[PDB]
Write a protein that binds this ligand. Structure first.
Ligand SMILES: *Cc1ccc(S(=O)(=O)N2CCN(C(C)C)CC2)cc1
Ligand SMILES: *Cc1ccc(S(=O)(=O)N2CCN(C(C)C)CC2)cc1
Lengths: 9, 229, 229, 9
C-alpha cells in the first residue's frame, strides 16, 4: 500500500 | 542552531539542499525557518514536508530492514541494539516535526489549505510513530493519528473541492492508515473508492494543469485499490 | 564515541548498517573498529572502504551540484556559503580517513595486499581533497595523492599478479587521477591501456570466479579508454 | 571518467 511519496518539491 | 540566519536565507538554502539531495540539511533549514515564528506560504509548507518526509523515509526503510533481520534471528544483542538506535532516532525526528506543528504552526493556520496541510502532517508523523510502537502506548499513538486525520478530513470535505490535491493526498494517506495501522481494510477500501469517484466527477471543472495534478494522485488511490481488491 | 563497544560488535553493526544503507553509521562503526588498534582483515578493510566511499561520494555529488549553481550565478552569499559548508564537511571526512591511515593502519600493514589497499585509499582521499582545493595548496595536495598512488603502484607491480583486483582498481583510480586532477590525459590513457593488456595476458591463469572479479574491473578500464579516445 | 565505484561490499 502506498502513501503519497512526498519526497520531491 | 539557525537563529542567526535570515529567514529568507534558510528558505533559499533549503531549496539548494533539495537540489543537492541533502535532506537532513534541508530539514534543519526548514526547522530554522519555522522557528522564526511567521506563518509559512504554500511553497514553504511543501519544502518543510519534503525535507522531513525524506529524512523519516530513510529512517523507516532502515528500521524495516533491521526489524526483518531481527525477526529472522528470533525464528547476540547487536541487531536489536542497532534496530533500537535507529528507532530512537526516527522517533526523535517525528517528535521534532510534531513539536513544530504544535508550536505553533497548527494554531496559527486559519485558512483551510494550511490547516488541512498541517493536520495531514500531524496524522502522518503519528502514523510513523505507530509503525514502531509496541503495546498499549501503540493504542494512544494510533488514536492521535486518527484524530488528526479525521479533523483534516472534516475540514477538507467542507472547504475544498474533491479534486484538491491536498484533499486527495490526505484521503490517500488516511486510507493507508486504515489498511496498515488500524486493521480496517474495508474502511481503507471504502475511503479510497469514494475519494476516487468523487474526484472523477469533478475533473470536468479543472484546467489542463490542475487535471494533471489531481489525476496523478487519483492513480495512487487506484493503485492501492488494485493491490487491496 | 565507540570506545565502549566490542570490536566484534562494531564489525557486526557495520555490516547491518550497510544492509540498511546507513553509511554514516557504517563509517562510524568502522572508525571505532580501527581505533581498537588491531590490524584489519581483508573483509574488514573492505567494510571500512565501502563506508567512507559512500559517505564521501554523497558529499562530492552535493558539492558538484552546489559548485555548478555557484558558477552559473557568477556568469546573495547563500550559494557560496552552503557550498563552503558542504566542502568543509567533505574535507573533514577526508581528514578523518587520512588520520586513520596515518594512525596507524599503513605503518602496521606489512603484507602487500594490505599495504597497497591502504595506500590506494590514501591516494583516493587526497584526490577528493584535490577536487575541491584552490591554488598552491592544491599543488601539495595533488602531490600527496600522486605519492601515495605511486608507492602503491610500485608495490603492486612487484608483489601482485597483473589481474589482482586491488592492483587493477589502483591502476584505474591512478589513471583517473592523471586524467582529472593532474592534467595528464596521455599518462592516464597509457596506464589504463598497459594495465588492461597485461591483465588480459594473465587471465588464462585464473579460476572462473577470479576471472569474473578481474574482468569486471578490466571493463571499467575499457570504459574509460572509450571515453578518452 | 569513472573510478572504482567501491560502494557495495
Ligand atoms: C500530502 C500532499 C502534499 C503535497 C501535494 S502537492 O502539492 O499537490 N504535490 C507535491 C509534488 N508532487 C510531486 C511533484 C509529484 C506531488 C504532490 C499533495 C498531497
Ligand atoms: C579499490 C578496490 C577495492 C576493492 C576491490 S574488490 O575487493 O576486489 N571488489 C569489491 C566489491 N566489488 C563489487 C561487489 C563490484 C568490486 C571490487 C577492488 C579494487
Amino acid at each position: 500500500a502506498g502513501s503519497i511519496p512526498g519526497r520531491r518539491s | 542552531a539557525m537563529g542567526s540566519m535570515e529567514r529568507a536565507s534558510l528558505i533559499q538554502k533549503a531549496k539548494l539542499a533539495e537540489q543537492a539531495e541533502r535532506y537532513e540539511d534541508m530539514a534543519a533549514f526548514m526547522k530554522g525557518a519555522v522557528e522564526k515564528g511567521e506563518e509559512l506560504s504554500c511553497e514553504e509548507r511543501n519544502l518543510l514536508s519534503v525535507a522531513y518526509k525524506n529524512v523519516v523515509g530513510g529512517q523507516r526503510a532502515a528500521w524495516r530492514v533491521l526489524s526483518s533481520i531481527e525477526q529472522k534471528s528470533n525464528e547476540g544483542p547487536e541487531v536489536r541494539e542497532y534496530r533500537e538506535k535507529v528507532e530512537t532516532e526516527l522517533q526523535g525526528v517525528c517528535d521534532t516535526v510534531l513539536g513544530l506543528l504544535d508550536s505553533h504552526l497548527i494554531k496559527e493556520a486559519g485558512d483551510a489549505e494550511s490547516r488541512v496541510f498541517y493536520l495531514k502532517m500531524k496524522g502522518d508523523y503519528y502514523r510513523y510513530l505507530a509503525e514502531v510502537a509496541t503495546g498499549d502506548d501503540k493504542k494512544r499513538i494510533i488514536d492521535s493519528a486518527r484524530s488528526a486525520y479525521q479533523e483534516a478530513m472534516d475540514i477538507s470535505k467542507k472547504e475544498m473541492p474533491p479534486t484538491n490535491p491536498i484533499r486527495l493526498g490526505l484521503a490517500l494517506n488516511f486510507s493507508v492508515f486504515h489498511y496498515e495501522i488500524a486493521n480496517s481494510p474495508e474502511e481503507a477500501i471504502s475511503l479510497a473508492k469514494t475519494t476516487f469517484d468523487e474526484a472523477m466527477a469533478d475533473l470536468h471543472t479543472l484546467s489542463e494543469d490542475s487535471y494533471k495534478d489531481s489525476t496523478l494522485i487519483m492513480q495512487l488511490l487506484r493503485d492501492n485499490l488494485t493491490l487491496w481488491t
